[PDB]
Design an enzyme around this catalytic site. Structure first.
Site: not given
Ligand SMILES: [Ca+2]
Ligand SMILES: [Ca+2]
Ligand SMILES: [Ca+2]
Ligand SMILES: [Ca+2]
Ligand SMILES: [Ca+2]
Ligand SMILES: [Ca+2]
Ligand SMILES: [Ca+2]
Ligand SMILES: [Ca+2]
Ligand SMILES: [Ca+2]
Ligand SMILES: [Ca+2]
Ligand SMILES: [Ca+2]
Ligand SMILES: [Ca+2]
Ligand SMILES: [Ca+2]
Ligand SMILES: [Ca+2]
Lengths: 424, 424, 424, 424
Positions: D43, D155, D164, D205, D242, D283, D310, D335, D363, D386
């Protein structure tokens, strides 16, 4: 909705011996009708599911089945609205309604009638042949038949100790040819009995019970018949025996060929017969509770000859489990009405199959026009069926059913005898 | 369009004796399937429609029916697209395609298989039971059964001259009770045979052939059995005989009870037996072509006793016509495969019915799981059926079928024996 | 007519590794659609059915499947008009159209795609779940999953010699709980790897390949993870290994824990690990053709430990037959695309089942969104499935499918681990 | 009547990370079945619709969804009898039943599951593909995919600040070729990582997180991979990022390349990267509440590069409205489960579309075998998707779905990249 049960009706009919038995009729909402009849033979004891008789001496000598037929009315109340496709839920619901281990309240004959009838109706609803409904897309194996030809023991007035002598056309290219081979040997046997002074009246299973002097005379007569029909004993037409040893057993001793034997003597008789005669299967060679000596028999002969438990196993998962644990037998006679549901019969076949035992799907002495066991044999790829001689249509009807299954399978049809699924 | 024939298939199956016979499968465009099997017995000669056998000595001892089965392929080419409801047009098309009086080209067995199969398919298409499809809204009469119990002549190894001794439960309130009476008397007979040390092996029809000394001993035994089961001979369970006189006839003389008789002596023997025993029916009491003496027999006994032609008539309309004109017999044994179509069988029953003769619908000694004759009996209100003993399911299946018809008829069901449609 | 094939289409899609694979779409006249995808992994050699690749270096690095996809067009010409219900005839028609033992002409990938698609379409036409269509009314057993967690050998950059370390929730009351147990142990493992500073990137199967020093370190880590999640090693969550011994075998020597071993040394390593760790199953413990030493391994460990052939059997009936005859292994990894039809896969499972071997239904390292193996496992009551770790949906989708099958089975659902159908 | 909802069932399944999520099953009276699974990712804060977790520490580490699954039972009570075609009424009824702005009572995961399932069922009832059901006769645009290849920030375990790095095959003639280009570049990247010392384990991913030293090293690696696969950077395969800038933002300062930057410094970093590297999309280049500096970024770069919100927009109509009013961003990440109904997702796409913003259908980190977003992308002509890397089937399944949509569209299929509907 279409496969929901709408109606279950039962009726008192007669079996092949002129004795009452149960039939059930199952109708689905889509109008599919399943009809099944229940066989009957002499109970072996405590683990055989209870056949409910009326015991009214003023009707059919006490052998009416009106109580079983009426009990299908309470089964109808429990099952209306359930899907015919849920065979297992159906069978479990009747098991729970009965509430007894041996189905002595509703009657194994009431319960099995509905169990088979429902399966026939579900196959018809899906427009599937019953063998394919019960077994899936590899239900393609036609069994080697165990064909009764000579009877002794308590099934005759002769000096043959063993109950049943059978031919098995193991070497046939197809079931259709297997049946012709069996038939030609049966008619050559009939001619050989008539040419000697011997009776050609037939017993329950459609075979002969001539006044023979010994087991050896029985086996030598089958070999004479096979030779007379033009077949090689063993490779083409082999022999099998139901010893029903429990019938001549008293207090650790087996009475056979006029002499009392110790278990090792009984085993030696079976060994000598096997080393002389092309016998590929022996059923109940030792009595139904002689486990330690069954062990010895299995260690000694089990490599080369099929050793079938009938009375030994009574189509019972617990008894077959003990047999598997102790290296006792390597085959089991499968009698639907000894356990009383299609589901429990399939569970027993599955236990036997995955433990490397052969399932021989069996008639009872009292049969009907029902042919379910032909479909059950092909569905489970059992590879063997015991359904009597080459006379009486409660027996011939199963062979006719297997001709129909073999024709419908076309190029997919396999004969157990040619692909190593016959006796071993 | 829905009732048009789409497919006719035939197969070689086995009869109740383990001999090849024909079955046919008829499919309609609406998906209705009719399946029928053809019986077989020993041919009587000239007027019996030809059962086509292969005469290949290397298959089933020359008794294959592959040629009959292949001939159904030519029947399929002629009949595809015709309505299954046009039974008569169907039968006439096969009669014309055969082109011979006795059906020796296609085979009576090929033609009858398609004839019965088509009728079963048409009943199923209309969702009518076959008895109602064949007979209309007064098809409600369950026949008195002629139940085989003792065999002699060429159907035994004994000193009984006559071929068959039967019980008929004429006094029963319903078919369901008639069947129970028959069964109780059969089991009381079995017990009485075993208690005297006489053989209990069964013949083709599911009855006994013990070593008895005379016809009188046979009849005395049935009376003993009836009394032992608690029934009144005559009023409740009466007797019937198939004399098959042509088996002991040579040079105008009948050999019976060890003495040569002139026709008048044979007639006197039948008269004496009737006045002594509650015999209500006698089949083939004189030889099939001894019409002058049949006249005398009919004038003498015909008012009190049913006199059935089997070999006398061979289910032939021409022969039955002459018999009606000359006051010969007062009943006829109806064998579908003696004439070879359902249509011609119905014509023969109609001729007998409207001439005041009784039609007794008959099995053959080689039967199958087919139950058509149960439905044919109820459809034509024939009032009598001859379908064997109280054992072997090729016999019991017809009794079971009649139980099913009686239950479906409900309050409309009549028993021939209670409404004057039984033997007379 | 409704179940006749109307259309077969194929397409080039991608597998879970981003490599081309085949999907087929089968439409029946009744509008039923079956859709199936074909997995892929590294071929083992001679007896593995040929996966047809395009070998065009300018498309997908030579791994296009356009030729396989085009070959489905020739399969469509052969199969249009055949019944989708005749799985075996369908499969036999494609085997015959290919004309090569290892399916190198059409491609195993082309043939298997149509084989699975057709089965999905036929299940949908009958409105049967695919597990029930394929297995009959005792298709009720949810498998124990073999859940990948740690990788070594040629599937990692570490000093672990063995290829795969798995957890098996043998002690769970249901598949639903088995899955939760697996998932909790996987997340407890992830936390323990991250807390030690070891990499948490996942391989093909959705498991970890951390830089560990030895097989023993792998097994100690799984025990730590199980304990950390609150489960009993052995009784609740037991271990299994894929040794893939042929990766470290040269010149009769196995290189393992830094030392060269003779076959007897390799066997002793497996024996020591078994006596120390709750390992219930070992796959490819010796090289695929070292049958004499497999014999010894089987005699020594086979009574207490499941010994799975993957490279040993290559899902081949001939190889499995020899293995059964020589007492080699007691389980077989079932890979649909190693043999190339559903039929031959079912034949191989049947051979294993009736010989007392366990069938472990297997993924390939390249999977898809297809869930057929979930249904194949339940249909054959295989009792075990190998479909990867607790991450990546080409793996999770099979677990989700089994959740759906377990819920639809209701009170009839059994877990292999609770009824003795798990590893043994 | 046929499209009325008859049944709504929900189930706890696992996502691609082995974490519980919700699936719903919707059955209509006509027997149409819709099935949908709900994704899950971390979230962003207050405007993201509440994913309901059980917070039972003894099940799945507190991440069970039994409460969400049970809440579908109250949704079933409200929705039974409503038409599946009334998507908007359906969604509004669940919004009203929940009664909270962020769906914290029923759970966004419960509500979205029913919302998507219903849509699938309605498409199936009309026999329309879901893209055509949702978008009408101009639903013909296949999106340019944003394909993950390298991960950093939170990540990864590396010194890449940005979250990303993606490739976009903008210059491909079709989606089918776009997918092949992406796949070839991904495998050429894998080979280049392996040839250096770098890890090839994949994250959520399906991409790589190697130990790289900087954002520039990431971008230079993608350019190396593109060149190695034979593609022109920019014109054929372009780059996208991103930044997830909110992750390295503290009190007005962005920490990037080891240095604290003022907003103008962060903007200059993005500007320098764009002027050097063929980056077509960025992004979350600035943090989710830094509107005044997003204004500057948009005025400066918005002409030449796509600027995707986003975290900025959280698929929220109010936040997107403010962004449109202030000239902030020019694209929005869509989303479904951030807002919780298909309807509100379509309202947000419509607002973005008619304001000249691009909709990139997205996604979550936690995906499933569901492919709805492929259909949602084509239905709304969004022109961008995406859905992760070129590995893991929760990602590949969406590409496979788009292959199926492109094939069904035939000559009507357009690729966003060739018709000016790609990034701008
Ligand atoms: Ca998120
Ligand atoms: Ca994002
Ligand atoms: Ca018994
Ligand atoms: Ca006993
Ligand atoms: Ca005796
Ligand atoms: Ca027995
Ligand atoms: Ca005759
Ligand atoms: Ca004559
Ligand atoms: Ca006669
Ligand atoms: Ca391999
Ligand atoms: Ca190899
Ligand atoms: Ca392996
Ligand atoms: Ca945030
Ligand atoms: Ca970092």
């Amino acid at each position: 909705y279409g496969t929901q049960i709408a109606e279950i009706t039962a009726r008192e009919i007669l079996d092949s011996r002129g004795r009452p038995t149960v039939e059930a009729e199952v109708h689905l909402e889509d109008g599919s009708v399943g009809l099944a009849q229940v066989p009957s033979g002499a109970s072996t004891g405590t683990f055989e599911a209870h056949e409910l008789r009326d015991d009214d001496p003023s009707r059919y000598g006490g052998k009416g089945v009106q109580k079983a037929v009426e009990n299908v009315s309470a089964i109808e109340d429990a099952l209306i609205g359930l899907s015919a496709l849920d065979q297992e839920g159906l069978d479990k619901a009747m098991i729970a309604l009965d509430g007894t281990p041996n189905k002595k309240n509703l009657g194994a004959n009431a319960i099995l009638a509905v169990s088979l009838a429902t399966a026939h109706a579900a196959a018809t609803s899906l427009n599937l042949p019953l063998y394919r409904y019960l077994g899936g897309p590899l239900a393609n194996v036609l069994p080697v038949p165990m064909m009764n030809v000579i009877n002794g023991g308590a099934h005759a007035d002769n000096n043959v100790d063993f109950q049943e002598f059978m031919i098995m056309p193991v070497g046939a290219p197809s079931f259709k040819e297997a049946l012709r081979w069996g038939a030609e040997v049966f008619h050559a046997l009939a001619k050989v009995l008539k040419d000697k002074g011997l009776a050609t009246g037939v017993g329950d299973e459609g075979g002969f019970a001539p006044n023979l002097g010994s087991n050896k005379e029985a086996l030598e007569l089958l070999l004479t018949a096979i030779e007379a029909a033009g077949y090689k004993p063993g490779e083409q037409v082999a022999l099998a025996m139901d010893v029903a040893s429990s019938e001549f057993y008293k207090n650790g001793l087996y009475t056979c060929d006029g002499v009392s034997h110790e278990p090792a003597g009984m085993i030696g008789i079976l060994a000598d017969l096997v080393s002389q005669y092309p016998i590929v299967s022996i059923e109940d060679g030792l009595q139904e509770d002689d486990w330690s000596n069954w062990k010895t028999l299995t260690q000694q002969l089990g490599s080369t000859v099929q050793l079938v438990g009938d009375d030994l196993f009574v189509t019972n998962p617990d008894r077959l489990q003990s047999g598997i644990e102790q290296g006792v037998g390597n085959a089991v006679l499968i009698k639907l009405n000894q356990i009383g549901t299609l589901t429990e019969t399939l569970r027993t076949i599955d236990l036997a199959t995955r433990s490397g035992y052969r399932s021989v799907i069996s008639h009872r002495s009292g049969e009907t026009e029902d042919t379910t066991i032909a479909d059950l044999a092909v569905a489970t790829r059992a590879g063997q069926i015991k359904t009597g001689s080459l006379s009486r249509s409660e027996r011939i009807a199963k062979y006719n059913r297997l001709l129909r299954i073999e024709a419908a399978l076309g190029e997919n049809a396999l004969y157990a005898g040619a692909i190593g699924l016959g006796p071993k």
